[PDB]
Amino acid sequence: MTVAEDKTFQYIRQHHSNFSRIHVLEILPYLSCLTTSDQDRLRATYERWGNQDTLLELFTSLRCRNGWVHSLIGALRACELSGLADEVARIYHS
């Protein structure tokens, strides 16, 4: 990852409680950096382990993927979390 991506990832880890509001199933179809195999894996993960544990798995999966920060920003806006999107963007460019 880039300096920007790492910095963004740490912001996310540090604001666990804000990001925990994300509904995994709702956000997945918007995350274009995930492959369809990635999405299948993550849905099956949700079914078994529920939203919170899957969120953790979702973020560590994301940062293994090219351009995940922008993928996440777009998805957050689509999931009525445009405020989180704006903070993620600001950190990434900070």
Numbering used by the authors: 1 to 94
Task: Give sentences from the paper.
Recognition of viral RNAs by RLRs leads to the activation of mitochondrial antiviral signaling protein (MAVS; also known as IPS1, VISA and CARDIF). Activated MAVS triggers rapid production of type I interferons and proinflammatory cytokines. It consists of an N-terminal CARD domain, a proline-rich region (PRR) preceding a poorly structured middle segment, and a monotopic transmembrane (TM) domain at the very C-terminus. The N-terminal CARD domain of MAVS is necessary and sufficient for forming active MAVS aggregates.
At the inter-strand interface, the positive and negative charges are alternately distributed at two opposite ends of each CARD subunit, indicating that the inter-strand interaction is mainly electrostatic. The positively charged residues R37 in the 3rd helix (H3), R64 and R65 in the loop between the 4th and 5th helices (H4 and H5) from the CARD in a lower layer (purple in Figure 2B) are in close proximity to the negatively charged residues D23 in the loop between the 1st and 2nd helices (H1b and H2) and E26 in the 2nd helix (H2) of another CARD molecule (cyan in Figure 2B) in the upper layer. E26, R64 and R65 are highly conserved among MAVS molecules from different species, but D23 and R37 are less so. As an alternative verification of the key residues for MAVS CARD self-association, we searched for mutants that disrupt the CARD polymerization in E. coli. We performed random mutagenesis and screened for soluble CARD mutants by using a recently developed solubility screen. Our screen recognized multiple sites that are important for CARD oligomerization. Biochemical analysis confirmed that most mutants from the screen were expressed as soluble proteins, and eluted as homogenous monomers in gel-filtration chromatography. Almost all the mutations out of the solubility screen are conserved and at the protein surface. They can be mapped to the two interfaces identified in the cryoEM model.
